[PDB]
Amino acid sequence: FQNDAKANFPDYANHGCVVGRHLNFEMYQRLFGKKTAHGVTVDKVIQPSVDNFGNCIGLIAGDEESYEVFKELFDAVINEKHKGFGPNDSQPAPDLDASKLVGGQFDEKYVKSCRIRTGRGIRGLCYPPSCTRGERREVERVITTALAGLSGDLSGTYYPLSKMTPEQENQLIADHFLFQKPTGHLMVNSASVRDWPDARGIWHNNEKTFLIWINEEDHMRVISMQKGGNVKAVFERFGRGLNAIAEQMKKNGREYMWNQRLGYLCACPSNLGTGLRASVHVQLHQLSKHPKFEDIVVALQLQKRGTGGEHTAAVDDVYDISNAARLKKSEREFVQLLIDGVKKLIDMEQALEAGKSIDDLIPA
Amino acid sequence: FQNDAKANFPDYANHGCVVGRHLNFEMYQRLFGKKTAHGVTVDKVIQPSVDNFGNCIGLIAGDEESYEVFKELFDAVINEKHKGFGPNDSQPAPDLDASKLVGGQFDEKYVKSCRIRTGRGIRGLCYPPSCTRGERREVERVITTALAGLSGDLSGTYYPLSKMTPEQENQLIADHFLFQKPTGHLMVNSASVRDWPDARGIWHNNEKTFLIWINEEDHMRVISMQKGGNVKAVFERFGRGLNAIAEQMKKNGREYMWNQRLGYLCACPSNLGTGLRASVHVQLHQLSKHPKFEDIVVALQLQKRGTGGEHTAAVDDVYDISNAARLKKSEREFVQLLIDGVKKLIDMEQALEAGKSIDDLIPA
Ligand SMILES: Nc1ncnc2c1ncn2[C@@H]1O[C@H](COP(=O)(O)OP(=O)(O)O)[C@@H](O)[C@H]1O
Ligand SMILES: Nc1ncnc2c1ncn2[C@@H]1O[C@H](COP(=O)(O)OP(=O)(O)O)[C@@H](O)[C@H]1O
């Protein structure tokens, strides 16, 4: 008996994962014995895809180096997932300049709130699927040390999950800032929830307009938010926050994971490039009952979902609309995509309100 | 930053695991960098204990070598779990001689069925927490190849979970021979359910008196059973089955995992020595309503539980009574422990049936 590639090749029958359609034995044999500097193997990065029979992606990176050592597998998946992204295609340079936005104010009669999120990795340390307790703790240390250097309207306080009081936990729940131990297949099967809640925590400023999660699904989850429809102001704080944290991190020789081709790196290939989801809560009483509604959203390159997030129902016809893509455009440009898209949606709503047709407002 | 033992030491506060009370930093530092020939680390074997806050054991072996490379941790836990087992204590030689049993027939008026189970590991291959798809498949191959050499009343057929038909699956469910993907903390947290159901299967003889599970929680789970109370006959088939399989395995240079001190090795320290649980279904209408019932069972060194197994209620006063221990006695002697114990229970029941006292039947 030999523990070789042939003996270890996954049985992808019945699976609906992207990986199974790209990881033929030819490729597996090649990648089988490879390892990153942190010991991440091909079996590691595909484990979730094997465990799950649903329509997953199944691909997860244990560390930054995963994207280079297992480049041909990630590129194949990335290419299909992000609807076209070859080996010579490159992510545009980061763009966090809020002042370059045009008309970043929404009619607050329809737009109730604005939210912009992204994820960062701390270079040198493994992603949650592979990180050790030591690494995870260093991630928390780096981040919290940096956050404590923030001032002004970015001044905040840190709430470690492992030292959280009933009173604090209760208030964070009411704020909807608390996160539980993940239970999703990708997180569970990738061993991303080990040692919970060791070195996990929540940070937020006094205004509660800037939220930070540590060691949840990414090293750092960044969230900027405001009531109303001033998306430009939400983006301005978003970029100013990321930059400020990065500046405090340089003091300790730490930086975000980023490279010319893929932009900001994270464990989940689906969230590469900008990892940015800009969204609004927008009320669309009439448009939502229009037969072309779902097609209009897709055409605008937006995504639609319930008020309570992914896989929830929309209450009082208020929808969570956001940019659908993550790659092939800069942050500032995705935010401009949301602006243009949402205003069009609002124009259509105001047409239906006046008993008019929207037939010639639809993206041809 | 250094990824050393100090940075990686588990925070055992709040935990009710045995490991936390033995794995002080002193020990952790020593074991931290160690590895078995299969790459099993200390972090691996204790991971479940860290993940779980309940009253677990939390210790699991990735391979056979785990018990030697991490000997001082396993010995500490084993010592406490099995109520006294020092470094110089030794498990008695295996004893599968059913003919050495005395009075192995139960009053079938009270004893409805008999069951005896154990677990085996195939030497050379890793336990479910650490095994690869290749290894797991080799385990299935070795076992099924051996089973196909069995004849007579040990002739049976193999039902691979990954090629199971609705009709077969339905019949196995009715027989209560099917096992699902484990969901318990120890199994989930130790990564023992990877690639389900790849290389998992069920084997049983025509009589349905001999059952075998492959790659569930152990490499091989062996179960002998009969209606009525002829425990001697159930043990006779049990031992004859284990020996026959071992004999077919030698043809291919394979053998069970076993050593002088710990007896038959398995991933779970709680099941070392004999890994043997001999049980009966015994109806105790009157005794079960006696205030001393639970104390009598413990004194007889037996265990009591519901008819549907662990954590179930007893229906019609029928209890699952079995030997409580796994170490410090031979198989044949645990079965004799069940015999002596159950007959005493039956004598007490027949006393209460006649309105007599059992005060002087109780183990002083
Ligand atoms: N524009 C918005 N305003 C207020 N809350 C929002 C907005 N967009 C999303 N949320 C909230 O964020 C939470 C997470 O949503 P989810 O669909 O998981 O997106 P993501 O995972 O990108 O945060 C949800 O409970 C939702 O209510
Ligand atoms: N003496 C017996 N006769 C018939 N069935 C039994 C007997 N003992 C246990 N069982 C059955 O075996 C199943 C597993 O029981 P469990 O408590 O998990 O013990 P184990 O894990 O050692 O098999 C249960 O559903 C139970 O009904």
Q: What are the angstrom distances between the C-alpha of B197 and each of A151, B181, B200, B204, B364?
A: 54, 8, 5, 18, 50
- State the virtual CA torsion across A165, A170, A173, A178 in degrees, nearest 10: 0
Q: How far apart are CA B2 and CA A93, in angstroms?
A: 33
Q: What is the DSSP string of B123-192?
A: TTS--TTT--HHHHHHHHHHHHHHHTT--GGG-EEEEEGGG--HHHHHHHHHHT-------SHHHHHTT-
Q: How far apart are CA A297 and CA A346, in angstroms?
A: 12
Q: What is the DSSP string of A244-300?
A: HHHHHHHTTT--B-EETTTEE--S-GGG-BT--EEEEEEE-TTGGGSTTHHHHHHHT
Q: How far apart are CA A64 and CA A201, in angstroms?
A: 23
B155 contacts B208 by C-beta, under 8 angstroms: no
- Give the residue numbers of the binding site of B for ATP: 113-117, 176, 221, 277-281, 305-310
Q: What share of chain B is helix, strand, coil (3-state, %, to 5)?
A: 40, 15, 45
Q: What is the DSSP string of B245-272?
A: HHHHHHTTT--B-EETTTEE--S-GGG-
Cβ contact (<8 Å) for B134 and A8? Answer: yes
B42 is written with which tokens? 């200390």
Helix pair angle (A71-81, A42-51), 10° resolution: 40
Give distance in angstroms: CA of A308 to centre of ligand 1: 7
Helix pair angle (B42-51, B71-81), 10° resolution: 40
A39 is written with which tokens? 């010991």
B326 contacts B276 by C-beta, under 8 angstroms: yes
Q: How far apart are CA B51 and CA A186, in angstroms?
A: 18
Sequence-distant (6+) residues with CB within 8 A of A2 are: B134
Q: How far apart are CA A274 and CA A271, in angstroms?
A: 7
Q: What is the DSSP string of A305-350?
A: EBTTBTT-PPGGGEEEEEES--SSS-HHHHHHHHHHHHHHHHHHHH
Q: What is the DSSP string of B182-215?
A: --SHHHHHTT-STTTTTT-EEEEETTS-EEEEES
With CA atoms as reference, report the closest residue to B194 among A189, A293, A106: A189
Q: How far apart are CA A182 and CA A203, in angstroms?
A: 18
Give distance in angstroms: CA of A171 to centre of ligand 1: 18
B29 is written with which tokens? 């530092």
- State the virtual CA torsion across A304, A308, A310, A315 in degrees, nearest 10: -40
Burial class (CB in 10 A: 0-12, 13-18, 19+), A7: middle
Closest residue in B to A254 (Cα) is: B1
- Give the residue numbers of the binding site of A for ATP: 113-117, 176, 221, 277-281, 305-310
Experimental technique for the deposited model: X-ray
Q: Give phi and psi for B221, each to the nearest 5.
A: -110, 120
Ligand 1 atom, smallest distance to A280 CA: 1
Cβ contact (<8 Å) for A134 and B51? Answer: no
Cβ contact (<8 Å) for B133 and A9? Answer: yes
Where b means 16+ CB within 10 Å and e means fewer, A271-294 reads bbbbbbbbbbbbbbebbbeeeebe
A242 membership: H or E segment, kind and range: helix A231-250
| Among A135, A195, A200, the residue to mutate for chain B (most B Cβ within 10 A) | A195
Residues in chain A: 364
Q: Candidates A179, A216, A217, A320: which one to mutate for ligand 1, based on the most atoms within 8 Å of Cβ?
A: A320
A77 contacts A269 by C-beta, under 8 angstroms: yes
Distance from the A131 Cα atom to the nearest Cα atom in chain B, whole angstroms? 10
* Residue indicated by tokens 């695991």: B17
Among protein residues, the one whose CA lies closest to atom 14 of ligand 1? A309
B89 is written with which tokens? 């204590």
Task: Give chain A positions within 8 Å (CB) of B50.
Answer: 194-195, 198
Query: Which residue type occupies A72?
Result: E
Among protein residues, the one whose CA lies closest to atom 4 of ligand 1? A113
Query: How many whole angstroms from its chain centre is CA A181?
Result: 17
Task: Give chain B positions within 8 Å (CB) of A47.
Answer: 194
Quickly count: other Cβ atoms within 10 Å of residue B220's Cβ: 25
Q: How far apart are CA B47 and CA B71, in angstroms?
A: 17
Give the nearest partner residue to A191 out of B10, B132, B191, using CB atoms.
Answer: B191
Cβ contact (<8 Å) for A162 and B11? Answer: yes
Distance from the A7 Cα atom to the nearest Cα atom in chain B, whole angstroms? 5
B296 contacts B360 by C-beta, under 8 angstroms: no
A116 contacts A209 by C-beta, under 8 angstroms: no
Burial class (CB in 10 A: 0-12, 13-18, 19+), B129: buried
Query: How many whole angstroms from its chain centre is CA B186?
Result: 14
With CA atoms as reference, report the closest residue to B123 among B300, B285, B257: B257
Q: How far apart are CA A74 and CA A270, in angstroms?
A: 10
Q: How far apart are CA B82 and CA B76, in angstroms?
A: 10
Q: What are the angstrom distances between the C-alpha of A329 and each of A63, A114, A145, A257, A273?
A: 24, 20, 31, 18, 8
Largest pairwise CA distance in chain B: 76
Sequence-distant (6+) residues with CB within 8 A of A293 are: A284, A287
Sequence-distant (6+) residues with CB within 8 A of A290 are: A296, A348, A352, A358
Residues in chain B: 364
Ligand nearest to the CA of B226: 2
Q: How far apart are CA B134 and CA B137, in angstroms?
A: 5
Task: Give chain B positions within 8 Å (CB) of A133.
Answer: 7-10, 43
B13 is written with which tokens? 């506060």
Where b means 16+ CB within 10 Å and e means fewer, A311-342 reads eeebeeebbbbbbbbbbbbbbbbbbbbbbebb
Pocket of ligand 1 (CB under 6 A): A 113-115, 117, 225, 277, 279-281, 305, 307-310, 320
Cβ contact (<8 Å) for B162 and A135? Answer: no
With CA atoms as reference, report the closest residue to B144 among B153, B134, B135, B157: B157
Give distance in angstroms: CA of B164 to centre of ligand 2: 23
Ligand 2 atom, smallest distance to B281 CA: 1
Pocket of ligand 2 (CB under 6 A): B 113-115, 117, 225, 277, 279-281, 305, 307-310, 320
3-state secondary structure of A358: coil
Q: Candidates B115, B220, B318, B345: which one to mutate for ligand 2, based on the most atoms within 8 Å of Cβ?
A: B115
Q: Give phi and psi for B109, each to the nearest 5.
A: -75, -25
**Preceding amide of A92 cis, omega within 30:** no
With CA atoms as reference, report the closest residue to A179 among A225, A224, A211: A211
Strand A318-323 and strand A302-305: the pairing is antiparallel
CA atoms within 13 A on the CB side of B27: 18
Q: How far apart are CA A29 and CA A72, in angstroms?
A: 13
Closest residue in A to B198 (Cα) is: A11
With CA atoms as reference, report the closest residue to A340 among A312, A363, A356: A363
Among protein residues, the one whose CA lies closest to atom 6 of ligand 1? A115
**Preceding amide of B197 cis, omega within 30:** yes
Among protein residues, the one whose CA lies closest to atom 12 of ligand 2? B309
3-state secondary structure of B331: helix
With CA atoms as reference, report the closest residue to B103 among B277, B229, B241: B229
Sequence-distant (6+) residues with CB within 8 A of B307 are: B281, B313, B314, B315, B318, B319, B320
Sequence-distant (6+) residues with CB within 8 A of B308 are: none
Strand A201-205 and strand A156-160: the pairing is antiparallel
Ligand nearest to the CA of A306: 1
Computed from CA positions of residues A94, A96, A100, A102, in that sequence, does the dihedral angle turn out positive or negative?
Answer: positive
Q: Give phi and psi for B86, each to the nearest 5.
A: -75, 180
B19 contacts B59 by C-beta, under 8 angstroms: yes
A331 contacts A236 by C-beta, under 8 angstroms: no
Give distance in angstroms: CA of A113 to centre of ligand 1: 10
Quickly count: other Cβ atoms within 10 Å of residue A119's Cβ: 25
Sequence-distant (6+) residues with CB within 8 A of A152 are: none
B140 is written with which tokens? 């299935």
Give distance in angstroms: CA of A315 to centre of ligand 1: 14
Domains and CATH numbers, chain B: 1-87 (1.10.135.10), 90-364 (3.30.590.10)
A196 is written with which tokens? 């919970």
Quickly count: other Cβ atoms within 10 Å of residue B252's Cβ: 12
B345 contacts B284 by C-beta, under 8 angstroms: yes
Dihedral class, residue B84 (left if φ above 0, else alpha if ψ from -120 to 50, else beta):
left
CA atoms within 13 A on the CB side of A295: 8
Closest residue in B to A8 (Cα) is: B134
Sequence-distant (6+) residues with CB within 8 A of B351 are: B357, B358, B361
Task: Give chain A positions within 8 Å (CB) of B51.
Answer: 194-196
* DSSP structure class, residue A87: T
Give distance in angstroms: CA of B182 to centre of ligand 1: 33
Q: How far apart are CA B70 and CA B31, in angstroms?
A: 7
Task: Give chain A positions within 8 Å (CB) of B43.
Answer: 132-133
A356 is written with which tokens? 């008019």
Give the nearest partner residue to A134 out of B8, B124, B162, using CB atoms.
Answer: B8
Query: How many whole angstroms from its chain centre is CA B287?
Result: 28
Q: How many helices (H) and strands (E) does chain B have?
A: 11, 10
| Among B130, B195, B200, the residue to mutate for chain A (most A Cβ within 10 A) | B195
Give distance in angstroms: CA of A179 to centre of ligand 1: 13
